[PDB]
Amino acid sequence: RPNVLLISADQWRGDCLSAVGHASVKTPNVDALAQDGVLFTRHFAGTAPASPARATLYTGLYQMNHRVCRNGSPLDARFDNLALAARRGGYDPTLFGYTDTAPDPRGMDPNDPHLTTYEGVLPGFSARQLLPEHEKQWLSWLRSRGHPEATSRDIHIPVGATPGEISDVAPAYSKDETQTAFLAGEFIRWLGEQDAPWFAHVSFLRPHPPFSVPEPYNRMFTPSDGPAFARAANREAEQAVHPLLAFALPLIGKDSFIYGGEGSASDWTSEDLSAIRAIYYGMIAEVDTQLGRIWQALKNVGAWDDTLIIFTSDHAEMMGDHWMLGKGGFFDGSYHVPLVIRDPGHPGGAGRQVERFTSAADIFPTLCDRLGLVPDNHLDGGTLVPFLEGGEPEGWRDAAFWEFDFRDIAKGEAERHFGLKSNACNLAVIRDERFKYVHFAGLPPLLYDLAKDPMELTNVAADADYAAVRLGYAEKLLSLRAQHLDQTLAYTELTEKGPVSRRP
């Protein structure tokens, strides 16, 4: 019955929405969706980076169940997902962009090109417009628009600017020529062809790096603007808190954030990071405008009040916090993501803001509930429908839970550095309103008193006065571990009258 529109925009911070009180950041179209919908203020990714993070999103599972530890980790073919379930509800789930699903290699022919990347399409989606890392479909679209220069990703370098340098200058393409504008247009054309209830997933790359954007967004924000950075006085002191920080922070490269970047991101100053943030803030504004354009096209076709809109991000961005750029680790900056759900079918909950901890694992259970679908296996998340109704679900979680795995199957760098097996190269986070407890399978734990230290700069795990707090969170995490074991078959019992099952 309703149309479903799942919109994701990569690497977008949960605190970077004007609707949540950001000083600098301007998100009017997200705000507009939240005015008529439910905004989730404590929404966390299941994990990081893109492939592990998206496996939570699409399967409704914690990394302890989906087992997608890194970009390139296969996702078991046994797992149900929102695309496959959508089809059991009579929809044809359609993709615009990417899912970053490494397929299950088992049984697949060794010569199959699908075995060579993590940039595969999630089973169940029908691809209308694909757009991988190579962006060849966008480049060819630019060529058809009068850009014979659009022959490579080099087109991302701002006009006249030095390759690999932070620049406020706009690239050769316009604001109506970004990958965002391209994908939105492709969605809008497809939307025009619809004559029945539709299911679409639009996956925008931006505000994910390279950090370059056309006019006006490039200069829309001043480097001096923006909130304080949640960081230690210096990089050395920051890294001294935990072995993982000492290992990971020096390895962050410039190439990952600026097109043509060379060397360590450690060579960028507080000023350089502030300049990057100004561009990032503009990039968020560019995606927001495109969302407005999507809202209008929905109204124009008369879909607006028949469409369940879910806007979110896979994982977020550190953006200078803790002298870091990118995703991964255990800090809030990398995991706290936006979530705005506009359900015209539940007007009761319109205008509301939810302060209960929510997970990316909750999206698939929400869709199942709302669309009257039954998942084919255990799910880790819970339905958000009671929050959309304007109420609160019974037995809801009281802390955010997420995981991060830093194993290296291909090169074994982290394993050699730490002197650990690949199965001990991980952490689990339990985070509520007062504390953050990080447990590492093979490194020391971390405990942050968010009341005293909201910036997470003081590890109090070894302080004797926090010993009982540390023990409490360790045992809470132990119950979470035990409760989230796979219940796919464990909720069934074979009796004399045949199988008997329980509903979660």
Q: Which is nearer to Mg ion, 50 or 284 (CB)?
A: 50
Can you spell out the DSSP letters for 111-169? Answer: T-GGGG-S-BPPTT-EEEEE--TT-HHHHHHHHTTT-TTTTSGGGGSPTTPPTTS---S
Q: What is the DSSP letter of 385?
A: H
Region of 86-94, 136-144, 163-171, 464-472 interacting with Cl ion (CB under 5 A): 86-94
485 binds, among Cl ion, Mg ion, a second copy, none (CB under 5 to 8 A by kind): a second copy
Token output for 25: 């950041």
* The residue type at 296: Q
When CB distances to Cl ion are compared, the closest residue is 90
Q: What are phi and psi of 176, to 5 degrees?
A: -90, 10
**CA atoms of 365 and 375, how far apart (whole Å):** 8
**CA atoms of 105 and 117, how far apart (whole Å):** 11
90 binds, among Cl ion, a second copy, Mg ion, none (CB under 5 to 8 A by kind): Cl ion
116 binds, among a second copy, Cl ion, Mg ion, none (CB under 5 to 8 A by kind): a second copy
Please report, as residue ranges, which positions from 178 to 217 form the binding site for Cl ion (by CB under 5 A): 197
10 binds, among Cl ion, a second copy, Mg ion, none (CB under 5 to 8 A by kind): Mg ion
Token output for 369: 């509930």
Q: Which is nearer to Mg ion, 314 or 380 (CB)?
A: 314
Measured CA to CA in angstroms, residue 146 lies from 135, 215, 347, 461 at distances of: 17, 18, 46, 59
Measured CA to CA in angstroms, residue 80 lies from 51, 60, 86, 248, 458 at distances of: 16, 9, 10, 34, 41
Which H/E stretch holds residue 468?
helix 467-483
237 binds, among a second copy, Cl ion, Mg ion, none (CB under 5 to 8 A by kind): none
Residue 371 CB, shortest distance to Cl ion, in Å, is 8
For residue 90, state whether it binds Cl ion (rule: CB under 5 A).
yes
For residue 345, state whether it binds Cl ion (rule: CB under 5 A).
no
For residue 119, state whether it binds Mg ion (rule: CB under 5 A).
no
**CA atoms of 233 and 225, how far apart (whole Å):** 19
24 binds, among Mg ion, a second copy, Cl ion, none (CB under 5 to 8 A by kind): none
Residue 447 CB, shortest distance to Cl ion, in Å, is 28
197 binds, among Mg ion, Cl ion, a second copy, none (CB under 5 to 8 A by kind): Cl ion
Q: Report the Cα 443 to chain-centroid distance in Å.
A: 26
Token output for 222: 């001043």
50 binds, among Mg ion, a second copy, Cl ion, none (CB under 5 to 8 A by kind): Mg ion
Site residues for a second copy per CB under 8 A: 64, 67-70, 72-76, 78, 102-105, 110, 115-118, 395, 405, 407, 409-410, 421-424, 426, 428, 439, 441-442, 445, 467-468, 470-471, 474-475, 477-479, 481-502, 504
Count residues contacting Mg ion (CB under 5 A)? 3
Site string for Mg ion, 41-60 (x = CB under 5 A): ---------x----------
Please report, as residue ranges, which positions from 310 to 349 form the binding site for Mg ion (by CB under 5 A): 314
Sheet containing 94-97: order of strands: 126-130, 94-97, 199-204, 3-9, 307-312, 339-342, 38-40, 353-354
Which H/E stretch holds residue 370?
helix 363-370
For residue 10, state whether it binds Mg ion (rule: CB under 5 A).
yes
Residue 452 CB, shortest distance to a second copy, in Å, is 21
Long-range contacts, stretch 262-271, CB < 8 angstroms, 24+ apart: 262/164, 265/325, 266/235, 266/323, 268/166, 268/325, 270/229, 270/320, 271/223
Q: Which is nearer to a second copy, 126 or 492 (CB)?
A: 492
Q: Which is nearer to Cl ion, 197 or 393 (CB)?
A: 197
Query: In 343-412, at which residue ranges do the beta strands (DSSP E only) sit?
Result: 353-354, 358-359, 400-405
Q: Which is nearer to a second copy, 227 or 444 (CB)?
A: 444
Q: Which is nearer to a second copy, 374 or 441 (CB)?
A: 441
Q: Which is nearer to Cl ion, 48 or 276 (CB)?
A: 276
Residues that bind Cl ion (CB under 5 A): 90, 197
Residues that bind Mg ion (CB under 5 A): 10, 50, 314
